Design goal:
5 copies of one chain form a homopentamer. Chain A contains 4 helices and 11 strands; from the N terminus they run E-E-E-E-E-E-E-E-E-E-E-H-H-H-H. In chain A, strands 1, 2, 3, 5, 6, 8 and 9 form a 7-stranded mixed β-sheet that branches. In chain A, strands 4-7-11-10 form a 4-stranded antiparallel β-sheet, with no helix packed on it. Chain A has about 300 residues and is of the alpha+beta class. Chain A folds into 2 domains: about 10-190, Acetylcholine Binding Protein, Chain: A; about 195-310, Neurotransmitter-gated ion-channel transmembrane domain (Methane Monooxygenase Hydroxylase, Chain G, domain 1), CATH 1.20.58. In chain A, helix 1 (about 195-210) packs antiparallel against helix 2 (about 215-240), helix 2 (about 215-240) runs antiparallel to helix 3 and helix 3 packs antiparallel against helix 4 (about 280-310). Bound molecules: 1,2-dioleoyl-sn-glycero-3-phosphoethanolamine (PEE) (4 copies). One 1,2-dioleoyl-sn-glycero-3-phosphoethanolamine sits at the interface of chains C and D. Chains A, B, C, D, E: One of its GO terms (cellular component) is plasma membrane. Chains A, B, C, D, E: It comes from Gloeobacter violaceus (strain ATCC 29082 / PCC 7421). Chains A, B, C, D, E: Homopentamer. Chains A, B, C, D, E: One of its GO terms (molecular function) is potassium channel activity. Chains A, B, C, D, E: This is Proton-gated ion channel.
């Protein structure tokens, strides 16, 4: 039908609010996730009001087809949402209440630069279609914004869920004042990563570092190269969960540094054996005794530098 | 169509019932499962009443779009259920019989705190929103709740499928709702895990422990490091199908313990070689003879303590 | 658009029939398969007795709409079939002819007790629900049951496709239903499994056994442990196919036996070295010479016993 | 609206034609691929004609729904094609032009017996629905068949695309029916296999064959067994892109040959060491000298014999 | 419902334009990328021009249907787009404004000759069919073609999104069609590839090379073969991504060169041992002294030549 008359001079306001029910399947490679929530809606329409004389219930219902309901669209969704109209009730004072239940698939960016200890924010954008007669603006009601007690994400924990009235849509066609942003702040659960990833890597490195206490060339070669193979194998477990990020990461820096340390250890073993063959054992002993202390200290300093760089 | 006439003394009640046909596709990483089942409803409409007189022996059977059907939805589903109506019958007394068949995908948490020998409970929720004229509450028909004898799940065995008879009424978004709970208790079939996982790891550990009866350095190093690599590969296989958790599991604790044991064995081999080279063979012999007994006993005690801690 | 009236109390019969066109995508882990075929029906409706003498000359052909067609469903399917009607024709006496083409994904359990050389049976179930005013039964018409010679399953031999004539009538949800069973017997092609799996395993086992002719500890350790690692990798490649089962299969038994043999070989090598160190070469020589004959004989005996146990 | 009257002496002939647009997703596990093309029909109907007088300048006419259109359905398709009519024109004589555009999934067998150097043939089948009034027989049209130069399949090159008639001696259809065959010939480009999968394996085998130029038992054992492990790893790599096939293959024969050669090499090394320890060095030298020449010649001859057994 | 009538012989032109919103899921093996964007159309239709003075309106809209809208279809898509009309508006002179929102999966070939540092161009094609006697041609509105500044793709740098203004007219199926081309130019981000793939490979190669400063045969064999195994594992990791291409890429050539280098290193070690055994230490010393310098220089020259060949 027709929109409400613009006889009222003030712009038409459509209050809004989303109530989350569940969020699931947050893919990391395509950075896409799904939602299932309640979409509430309300606006004032003085054209179709109600008087208490008809009945004392003070409540009347209507149909989706007979009453003009403004069209609200989602910006970043793969496909249009699935609408299931629930209930509408018209107060005697003209205010209407509109409900819907929808499910969607949302595209949002993710920043994996502190991958084990990162926090992400997921956005949902709302726009409206301007009507010919009057002016349509949006608003947020803090009462209709919330999340259920049974919202869970596998591996994450939800922190909060708010909204803003930002009318700052990128200018395309007369919609540069009719946007809305909903923010979902989440954090990753990182405790399981310690005993599953970090400590075995340190154990393998320390195993390979025992070559500085022996002078047998064959045993040193076996130790170092076999531990290198074990490190390459452990990279497979490191990779089977972490995404295929085409950019720098904390874990990537750690792995590259580990490769560098293995190379330097091989060089040290080679030079020690070569010096010992040339009837210069004192220099070889001095070099290996220096390396015994040099290696862990440099490893710890590089760890500290990297941690300060990425988290500060 | 309009709701049944408000008798102004009692809210409308609806008696539900779910009959399982088969369950399948219990995803472990996403904690989902798929269902196929019946759904039968029943309530009282004061109208549509007719006596058996005037050829009324044939009970009436209307069609959708001609009567009033309550909207009943599942809370924890990815998408709205795909359903098709089977039969609708109206008794001469005034009640109505309703049947339906649906398929759906359900989200439910899982608890892998005892992962090889765990038990899980799965939930299905039914909700209904009170209309603007009449209140609606739910009920349970205990003779229409059950499962086929042919309901099989791959990897699990089914124990019970009941329904809690007490709805949890509450008010949400300025309207009153009633929620039902269905519980499907299952247990895991753990027989396949023993000879495929547990025994080979024990064999590999016992193989790596043979280095205490030897005295050559190269053979000891080869044995221990190669067995460590084999353990890493078995860890690959084990963790290929186990989701990450915020708590500490059983298998993760055991795997970390075995990593610690390998590290300590490497340390002991290095110490023995270093002592032997420095011309103190008696001390090295005493150390290795002590370790021969010390290792299995400590392993046994640690395993027993862990089993008591988790399953106590 | 209403069920035909019975004469006095007799029920109505429908003669079904399925003609396979192609089977594909047989999953072991999911225990499903796909199929598309023809569904043929025929029943009696005497409200439409055609008279060719005066009212027309040719028998009537109808359209899917505005004609009473029995509802037919499949019990063990994930979702409802996607069927397109082909033709409906009415004979002068009153018997209706019907055809349609459909597809679905069928669920049926499998048996893996003889996995390399196992034979399976697959079931498809039809059903129909009795209306209040009429009772409906099902029947088989053997002239429309069959399969195309082009029906090919990748990796299986199709033997027969028959139906059990006698239905199974039962009362479910306070109504009478009838059920039909279609059995499709298939057998696995096992020749590809011999060179791909069986023989490399034997070659690696013999390579491991070749260590009883050597007297060097380092070489024996290298041989046995490297062959164990190769066996672990091949076990991973094999196990990527067979799902976990509550019972014990054949391949699992053979793999466990091979692990046992590896453990015993390691123990033998360790004992031989330990005895040789103590200046008792006679005992070590006797032990290794006895093992040279003991190992293959026991392997052969164990394999024969297992083959008799599982296939007898 | 009505089938054409059987007025002409010969039955009703339709001129068909398929014009490919692009192809993609040639899945090999399911032996299926998707298509996108045009479907142009043509038939004659003297019943309605547009004589060139009385404003008969309109050569063609547009009849979307008030005209008879034969039902053309595919045979080997998972689901019904997604077709939408493009153009409908009626010539003044009576010949009718028809045209659509469809997308579908095809099920055609694949044969990987010469996998690196194989060729395939993909079939698409067309059948027509008979009508009691007039007989309908399919007929190809040479000018309406073809394909774009913009078709492409990843890893394949297209040789030809033609059509031929094929009587339908199948489907047990009690009515007379006709079928059409469309054949697409594709040859795989094998160039990217010689430097990717073949030559590295030759290099690994030749590396393993250098154990015949040494007398050190430990070095020979390490060489041969580590190269066997490398062969297993390369087999794991190769398994990435090959199909999971249930029959014999050329590549499988090559892999089995390589395993056999590794076994024989280990046996030779053991024999040489056993003879050398037994104070018979001349025999060991003779055996090694024989092996140096024997191994490559036998490998080449067996490869020639396998290449003759296949490919002919 | 009817195409606009021509004046005498002139054709009808429609002005198009695509405003990008977001691109994602750029599959390299399948060579597809999903997309969703605004689509705009505009054309002149004088059969429904109005009088602004009498009607009292300055813009006139219509329902989504009940007006003649040209059929615009994409050529290289897997299926028809998921259209969503947003607005139809008309100008007083007769021009029709139009909007639409869609999403689709496109097909486009790629070039992988410079895979780490390559740039690609993606194509979107639009076509229209000539209905009636009114020829239809396309045109580009330069102020509507654009891209959102938030259009992002993971790992790619987006340079431009332009269109070729001149269409291409050709006769398909004895009918004329006009085609437009939309080009999206992107370049790959290569920084993450260097520390992930390039440098570990070099470190492993240098670890292999360190064997020219040694004399012990067992240590050299262990070093070279273990580094070869690690190289095979990294080959697995890299081959996970790249598809099969009929031509030779940069990475494939580099990998083959590395394989050849490993083979030559094994040969050199073998010949050094063979010469030293025959009591000729001087020749072996000279050979190894030469090889120490010879290997890195040859590697550098080969890399330089490859870089000049593929980029010159
Ligand atoms: C489980 C715990 C972990 C087990 C690690 C592997 C055990 C290796 C056993 C090695 C035995 C060994 O080296 O000694 C062999 C020693 C030889 O010395 P004798 O002269 O007989 O007596 C010593 C004084 N003259 O004794 C034997 O031959 C006994 C036979 C060995 C049986 C080992 C059984 C192991 C069972 C594990 C379960
Ligand atoms: C497999 C069958 C093995 C049977 C046992 C072979 C055996 O005892 O070999 C010893 C046998 C007897 O000579 P000595 O006692 O070493 O002098 O010598 C050999 O190894 C001969 C070769 C046996 C080949 C075994 C495989 C066939
Ligand atoms: C099933 C078999 C499983 C066991 C396989 C063991 C590996 C094969 C034997 C390798 C070593 C044999 C050996 O050293 O024999 C040398 C020994 C020396 O001769 P005498 O003068 O008695 O001293 O005997 C021989 O030369 C026999 C020839 C052996 C080669 C053929 C072996 C074939 C075995 C697998 C079939
Ligand atoms: C089929 C062909 C593949 C063959 C598979 C085995 C590969 C073996 C590679 C050669 C092993 C090394 C030979 C060796 O040590 O010879 C040293 C021997 C020393 O004796 P003199 O004093 O010269 O008399 O001779 C040499 O110095 C030979 C120098 C060149 C040897 C390597 C050349 C390349 C070999 C073939 C490469 C592939 C083609």
């Amino acid at each position: 039908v027709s929109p409400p008359p613009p006889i009222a001079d003030e712009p038409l306001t459509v209050n809004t609010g989303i109530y989350l029910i569940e969020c699931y399947s947050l893919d990391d490679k395509a950075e896409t996730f799904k939602v299932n929530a309640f979409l509430s809606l309300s606006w004032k329409d003085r054209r179709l009001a109600f008087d208490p004389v008809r009945s004392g219930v003070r409540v009347k219902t209507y149909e989706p087809e007979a009453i003009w309901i403004p069209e609200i669209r989602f910006v970043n969704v793969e496909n249009a949402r699935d609408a299931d109209v629930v209930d509408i009730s018209v107060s005697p004072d003209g205010t209407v209440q509109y409900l819907e239940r929808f499910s969607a698939r949302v595209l949002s960016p993710l920043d994996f630069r502190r991958y084990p200890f990162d926090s992400q924010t997921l956005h949902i954008y709302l726009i409206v279609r301007s009507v010919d007669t009057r002016n349509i603006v949006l608003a947020v009601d803090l009462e209709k914004v919330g999340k259920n007690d049974d919202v869970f994400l596998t591996g994450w924990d939800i922190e909060s869920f708010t909204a803003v009235v930002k009318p700052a849509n990128f200018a395309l066609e007369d919609r540069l004042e009719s946007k809305l942003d909903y923010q979902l702040r989440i954090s990753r659960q990182y405790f399981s990563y310690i005993p599953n990833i970090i400590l075995p890597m340190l154990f393998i490195l320390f195993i390979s570092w025992t070559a500085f206490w022996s002078t047998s060339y064959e045993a040193n070669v076996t130790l170092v190269v076999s531990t290198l193979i074990a490190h390459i194998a452990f990279n497979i477990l490191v990779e089977t969960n972490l995404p295929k990020t085409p950019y720098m990461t904390y874990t990537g820096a750690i792995i590259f540094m580990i490769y560098l340390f293995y190379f330097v250890a091989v060089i040290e073993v080679t030079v020690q054996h070569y010096l010992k063959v040339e009837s210069q054992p004192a220099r070889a002993a001095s070099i290996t005794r220096a390396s015994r202390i040099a290696f862990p200290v440099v490893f710890l300093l590089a760890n500290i530098i990297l941690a300060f760089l990425f988290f500060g």
